[PDB]
RNA sequence: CGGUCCUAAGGUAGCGAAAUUCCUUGUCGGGUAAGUUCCGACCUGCACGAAAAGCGUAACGACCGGAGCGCUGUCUCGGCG
RNA sequence: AGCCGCAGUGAACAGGCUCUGGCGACUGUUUACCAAAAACACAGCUCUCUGCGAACUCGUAAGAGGAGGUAUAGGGAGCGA
RNA sequence: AAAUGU
RNA sequence: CCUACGGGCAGGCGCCGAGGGUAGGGCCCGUGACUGGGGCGAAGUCGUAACAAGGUAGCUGUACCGGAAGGUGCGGCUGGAUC
RNA sequence: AUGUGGACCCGCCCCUUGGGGUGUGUCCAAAGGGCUUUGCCCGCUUCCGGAUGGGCCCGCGUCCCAUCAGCUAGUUGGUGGGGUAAUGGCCCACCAAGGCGACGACGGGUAGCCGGUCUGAGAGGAUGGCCGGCCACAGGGGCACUGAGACACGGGCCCCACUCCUACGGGAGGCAGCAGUUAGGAAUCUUCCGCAAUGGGCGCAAGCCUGACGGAGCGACGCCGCUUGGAGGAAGAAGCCCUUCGGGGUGUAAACUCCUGAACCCGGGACGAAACCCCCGACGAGGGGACUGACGGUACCGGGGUAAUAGCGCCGGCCAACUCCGUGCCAGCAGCCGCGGUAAUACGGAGGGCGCGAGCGUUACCCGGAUUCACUGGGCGUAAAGGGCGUGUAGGCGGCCUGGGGCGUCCCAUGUGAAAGACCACGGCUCAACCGUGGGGGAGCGUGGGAUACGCUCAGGCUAGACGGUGGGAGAGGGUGGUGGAAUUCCCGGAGUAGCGGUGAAAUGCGCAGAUACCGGGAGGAACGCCGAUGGCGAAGGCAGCCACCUGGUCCACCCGUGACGCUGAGGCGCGAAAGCGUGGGGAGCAAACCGGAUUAGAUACCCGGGUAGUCCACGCCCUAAACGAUGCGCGCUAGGUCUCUGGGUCUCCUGGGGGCCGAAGCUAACGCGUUAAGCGCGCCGCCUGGGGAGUACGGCCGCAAGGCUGAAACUCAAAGGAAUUGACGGGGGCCCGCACAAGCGGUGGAGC
């Protein structure tokens, strides 16, 4: 533009929209499972991904993803929401942390146990 | 009309140079003058001569360049590789004596209007002044 | 979307359980502690629909309908003068 | 600035208010004597007739209304700002 | 005159 | 009542006064039968509008119409092929 | 009562906004307690100072939405009062009708502000938590009292909400103090010790109080420091992985041999503490003498002394680290690009490897990278972006000369810029983290003094910008009123038949009621052939037969007048093709919608026959567009060649103003632009910031309506895009071949095998 204009308006300051609004500047947020089911992802691939619909604190009810191999989640199961979409499944924008509240870790998982809420197994005897 | 005459001068030169000519005529002022001068004193130009054209005064400014190079495009290097208005009517640039350019590491030269007149970066520093930075040249 | 039969041509828009809806107190929503009425929706319009006009409309009405406030011998329930 | 009473438009003559539907735009008209209305009328829109001794109406006729007007006029019809 | 193809 | 009494205190009156009550507006959020499109999503149905002159050159503002893309009228644009 | 002394009215005095001095008049002071008592000490009352802490006021700075554009009755000023430590509309009267706002009032949303802090090359951006400074609140509100000081957290009155006690006879409480409980939450601790020290209150002083503070406690929450060992130790066991079965790997790793030795046991044991007080001297100066350590028997010191926890992430690309197996678009991974379909370095386990290590990951958020809001430091012909075109208000910007002013700007000096932090140097805890000492500097802001180049400003002066005069030029520039001819259509007459129309071919349609084709006449509407152009005019939309009137812009020549009067332009205002709207005309041709005939699977299309609004006129609305050169306006600068329209010239040629082409240099992502810029530059305006959602929704304004203007968000995609390249394709083209058709002879398809 010109300099005169710059005094008249200035430059606008972008702003940044969140992608985890269900959390409110929180690292996590506890919730309760409403539905627990399987869904079909973007054509790109194909499978039957496990996601829960979670009613949390703030009246909110969002679809959260259940990662790993199998779980222990019927309906009324307390949960803990993480943050991070799935990309395959549209609409889901949140993960569930394992081994916290009514959702437990992945059984007989030996590698990336930091996630998957899996405690270290005994190796000797 | 010409919102800026000083820019028009510089720009007239820059236009003239890029076609490698002898002289460059430009409307006269006592302030355009002591601005040129340096360009001879620092030997960016041959120099000028106050002349008149069609009853009206101008300043034929004589252009220096360099050696007829060889290879394709034998056109010589310029003396004036770069020159641009800084302070403008759209935005006037003033600086304290501290806040003062190191144009192309000494190789370049700023030009400024001060309480003692058309100094340079080097001069204005030593006289201890600073003022309205007109332009930079190299 | 298609087939087939028929017609002079087969109801467009917009409205629609309506001063029109038989089934009917249609179903849903609002109102109420409770609403066959009323208001708002759906459309399966028995049997709306464009000058015997269609759909709206501010203002107007001793017209007809539903709700509330206020106030009452209308009433609980009658008594006296 | 004060005075009195429960009360000062101290008696008498003087609207109860709101929200929201249907119908009719509206003031008006009507079944004298059971219906005042959502019926009639209404400005306004359309169709149609009518060249002037107009069409149309009354009358056997004369005559007259139309109109002492002449298509921006007049008659008939439906719808009804 | 001449449509289409996970 | 106290005298320090032309005084003072109690005490009575008044203006303001938290807030309460009645009434009418304004903004904002949540919510509502139903309804409007919109986005994404599986190898569903109908057609062929556009990209090759796309088999009617296309796009376009407006108008009317049609199950749907679209079609047609008026004017405009070339971001239109073609002896 | 005393009056140094102070206050108040009037005076003069100086000074100057109620400061100082004085004149008179009138009002004001009190306190005693203890003694190494006859002397001192702790207090009392008035005044002026000092110092410290403040109150009020002022200039400048301080967030988002204009989809909040108008706000205001103590409102603004005055006068006089009330009030305060004192100004003031702070309150109250009265008078006036002012006060504020595109430099963003008023309204709405969020927020305690700063020193700092985080990031950043910087400029910035982000942030205000511990520490420090200030403001504000003490359950929600109101109020005053006492007081030097408060409208007061642990003081008081009242109202409300809430909770508790009670023989219920009624009353009580305010953790945002220290701990602690509950609830909420992803989540944040001990109901510890001590006044030993520092600080604070009271007292002459002992001494007292101090959940300030000094310590301890809990939490890898962070930073820092340290351990789970060291030397040796094989051609290198076993086990586990691969294996081309030869071998390779883990791997000096282990074992094993020496050595030290965290922890733990014993002893000792602090600094932090020197004053208050006490002795002499006068309790002063002075020496001197004395008590006290919560942390704690702690750190540290000595000796003795034990080989003593390792985990987490990753190993497709970015990105460092590869192999078997299982799985088979399943189970699953994912920050993006993407991996999985029976041979997966991308899933799951394993071996091995890379990377950190009492840590490793993850999520959320801030800055960087992002030059992606671009001041430093960007763009708008086709990628997102030039306002449809004018006129113009505020505003921004401004040519040549000489003065005065010195506003901006520049220099010097000075004050201020707190401490803490950060940075530099050295010390202190065995280092570091922490901590101390000292130095290093502004930025800004006040004040003083200077400089005049520039901008500004006041004054004066010119003429190159701009405006004007005179003479003229071209032109479909605009408005009004007339007028002409060709043609279509219809009506009348004549003549004249058997078909005309129409198409790819037809049909619908018209025609023996005399059509088409031909002549003559009449009425009406609309548009103007050749000229005519790749041309001209207009700011744009746009403007075309001809005549007249009214009228705008513009170009040339002469170089006369005015004297910078300029350029741009948020808002405002005006114009603005077509369609469309209202009220009246008008209606030939054409033609949405509508009907019909054909085509077709269907054909609400294309082609054909009909056909109403509309198209045309007046007046008034609507205000859109591929309103395009997809290129805003004005000025200056930077090669030429050619074609043309229109001026002037000593009419070759030169020069002026337009309309195109190719092109120097230069620009561009390329295509291309190029004195008619997209080159080099200055001024000003409009606009852009991934695609979709969407020019939609809500709000506002405008409109009769249709709609126009302004114009988002959630959500969703990992691209959407520009130009160019090579291919393929085309119911695109040119050239050419093939039993590829055609030309010609035999068959297959039927029958039986
Ligand atoms: Mg796949
Ligand atoms: Mg697939
Ligand atoms: Mg993994
Ligand atoms: Mg028929
Ligand atoms: Mg019917
Ligand atoms: Mg119909
Ligand atoms: Mg219908
Ligand atoms: Mg409806
Ligand atoms: Mg009902
Ligand atoms: Mg009915
Ligand atoms: Mg019901
Ligand atoms: Mg109910
Ligand atoms: Mg109910
Ligand atoms: Mg009834
Ligand atoms: Mg109803
Ligand atoms: Mg009816
Ligand atoms: Mg009927
Ligand atoms: Mg009818
Ligand atoms: Mg009716
Ligand atoms: Mg109705
Ligand atoms: Mg009535
Ligand atoms: Mg009674
Ligand atoms: Mg009685
Ligand atoms: Mg009274
Ligand atoms: Mg009365
Ligand atoms: Mg009475
Ligand atoms: Mg009355
Ligand atoms: Mg109705
Ligand atoms: Mg009526
Ligand atoms: Mg009506
Ligand atoms: Mg009436
Ligand atoms: Mg009657
Ligand atoms: Mg009767
Ligand atoms: Mg009656
Ligand atoms: Mg009546
Ligand atoms: Mg008669
Ligand atoms: Mg008769
Ligand atoms: Mg007669
Ligand atoms: Mg008569
Ligand atoms: Mg008569
Ligand atoms: Mg009539
Ligand atoms: Mg009627
Ligand atoms: Mg199909
Ligand atoms: Mg009040
Ligand atoms: Mg009140
Ligand atoms: Mg309200
Ligand atoms: Mg919905
Ligand atoms: Mg589909
Ligand atoms: Mg098409
Ligand atoms: Mg097609
Ligand atoms: Mg076709
Ligand atoms: Mg086509
Ligand atoms: Mg095309
Ligand atoms: Mg169209
Ligand atoms: Mg329809
Ligand atoms: Mg249909
Ligand atoms: Mg389209
Ligand atoms: Mg067209
Ligand atoms: Mg155009
Ligand atoms: Mg006395
Ligand atoms: Mg005095
Ligand atoms: Mg006293
Ligand atoms: Mg005593
Ligand atoms: Mg103080
Ligand atoms: Mg007053
Ligand atoms: Mg006063
Ligand atoms: Mg006063
Ligand atoms: Mg006070
Ligand atoms: Mg603003
Ligand atoms: Mg607020
Ligand atoms: Mg706050
Ligand atoms: Mg800051
Ligand atoms: Mg830093
Ligand atoms: Mg740094
Ligand atoms: Mg900064
Ligand atoms: Mg800040
Ligand atoms: Mg914070
Ligand atoms: Mg804090
Ligand atoms: Mg602080
Ligand atoms: Mg509390
Ligand atoms: Mg207190
Ligand atoms: Mg208080
Ligand atoms: Mg306070
Ligand atoms: Mg307390
Ligand atoms: Mg507490
Ligand atoms: Mg909890
Ligand atoms: Mg606690
Ligand atoms: Mg603590
Ligand atoms: Mg102490
Ligand atoms: Mg002390
Ligand atoms: Mg003391
Ligand atoms: Mg004592
Ligand atoms: Mg105590
Ligand atoms: Mg204590
Ligand atoms: Mg402490
Ligand atoms: Mg620790
Ligand atoms: Mg942890
Ligand atoms: Mg080996
Ligand atoms: Mg081995
Ligand atoms: Mg070893
Ligand atoms: Mg040993
Ligand atoms: Mg000891
Ligand atoms: Mg002591
Ligand atoms: Mg001493
Ligand atoms: Mg001593
Ligand atoms: Mg010990
Ligand atoms: Mg030892
Ligand atoms: Mg060991
Ligand atoms: Mg060892
Ligand atoms: Mg890693
Ligand atoms: Mg890395
Ligand atoms: Mg690698
Ligand atoms: Mg193998
Ligand atoms: Mg397998
Ligand atoms: Mg495999
Ligand atoms: Mg494979
Ligand atoms: Mg990976
Ligand atoms: Mg793996
Ligand atoms: Mg391993
Ligand atoms: Mg490994
Ligand atoms: Mg910039
Ligand atoms: Mg850019
Ligand atoms: Mg530009
Ligand atoms: Mg485009
Ligand atoms: Mg574009
Ligand atoms: Mg333009
Ligand atoms: Mg404009
Ligand atoms: Mg416009
Ligand atoms: Mg101006
Ligand atoms: Mg100026
Ligand atoms: Mg100037
Ligand atoms: Mg300073
Ligand atoms: Mg001077
Ligand atoms: Mg001056
Ligand atoms: Mg002047
Ligand atoms: Mg003239
Ligand atoms: Mg002229
Ligand atoms: Mg002309
Ligand atoms: Mg003319
Ligand atoms: Mg004309
Ligand atoms: Mg004839
Ligand atoms: Mg004849
Ligand atoms: Mg026939
Ligand atoms: Mg015939
Ligand atoms: Mg015949
Ligand atoms: Mg003829
Ligand atoms: Mg032109
Ligand atoms: Mg044009
Ligand atoms: Mg003229
Ligand atoms: Mg002259
Ligand atoms: Mg003169
Ligand atoms: Mg202008
Ligand atoms: Mg504005
Ligand atoms: Mg107008
Ligand atoms: Mg228009
Ligand atoms: Mg038009
Ligand atoms: Mg219409
Ligand atoms: Mg019209
Ligand atoms: Mg009409
Ligand atoms: Mg036709
Ligand atoms: Mg058809
Ligand atoms: Mg047909
Ligand atoms: Mg069929
Ligand atoms: Mg047709
Ligand atoms: Mg545009
Ligand atoms: Mg241009
Ligand atoms: Mg402009
Ligand atoms: Mg000309
Ligand atoms: Mg000539
Ligand atoms: Mg030219
Ligand atoms: Mg070119
Ligand atoms: Mg070249
Ligand atoms: Mg040229
Ligand atoms: Mg976007
Ligand atoms: Mg977007
Ligand atoms: Mg968008
Ligand atoms: Mg819109
Ligand atoms: Mg639009
Ligand atoms: Mg909005
Ligand atoms: Mg709206
Ligand atoms: Mg626009
Ligand atoms: Mg392309
Ligand atoms: Mg080809
Ligand atoms: Mg081809
Ligand atoms: Mg060919
Ligand atoms: Mg053959
Ligand atoms: Mg044959
Ligand atoms: Mg044969
Ligand atoms: Mg066979
Ligand atoms: Mg056979």
From Swiss-Prot, chain A:
Cellular component per GO, a single term: small ribosomal subunit
GO biological process, alphabetically ordered: translation
Annotated region described as Disordered, given as residue ranges: 105-125
PROSITE patterns for this protein: RIBOSOMAL_S12 (PS00055)
Bias kind Basic residues: ranges: 108-119
Modification after translation (UniProt): The methythiolated Asp-88 contacts a modifed residue of the 16S rRNA close to the decoding center, and might be important for decoding center assembly.
Keywords: Methylation, Ribonucleoprotein, Ribosomal protein, RNA-binding, rRNA-binding, tRNA-binding
Annotated positions of the 3-methylthioaspartic acid modification: 88
InterPro entries cross-referenced by the UniProt entry: NA-bd_OB-fold, Ribosomal_uS12, Ribosomal_uS12_bac
Gene3D superfamilies xref list: Nucleic acid-binding proteins (2.40.50.140)
Pfam families: Ribosom_S12_S23
Molecular function GO terms recorded: rRNA binding; structural constituent of ribosome; tRNA binding
Biological role stated in the UniProt entry: With S4 and S5 plays an important role in translational accuracy.
Subunit structure, as described in the record: Part of the 30S ribosomal subunit. Contacts proteins S8 and S17. Interacts with IF1 in the 30S initiation complex.
Protein family according to the UniProt entry: Belongs to the universal ribosomal protein uS12 family.
NCBIfam families tied to this protein: rpsL_bact
Name of the protein in its database record: Small ribosomal subunit protein uS12
Organism: Thermus thermophilus (strain ATCC 27634 / DSM 579 / HB8)
Gene name of this polypeptide: rpsL
UniProtKB/Swiss-Prot annotation, chain B:
One biological process term in Gene Ontology: translation
Keywords associated with the record: Ribonucleoprotein, Ribosomal protein, RNA-binding, rRNA-binding
A cellular-component GO term for this protein: ribonucleoprotein complex
Domain of life: Bacteria
SUPFAM superfamilies per UniProt: Ribosomal protein S8
Keyword Acetylation assigned: no
Function: One of the primary rRNA binding proteins, it binds directly to 16S rRNA where it helps nucleate assembly of the platform of the 30S subunit central domain. The combined cluster of proteins S8, S12 and S17 appears to hold together the shoulder and platform of the 30S subunit.
HAMAP family named among the record's database cross-references: Ribosomal_uS8_B
Name of the protein described by the UniProt record: Small ribosomal subunit protein uS8
Organism this protein belongs to: Thermus thermophilus (strain ATCC 27634 / DSM 579 / HB8)
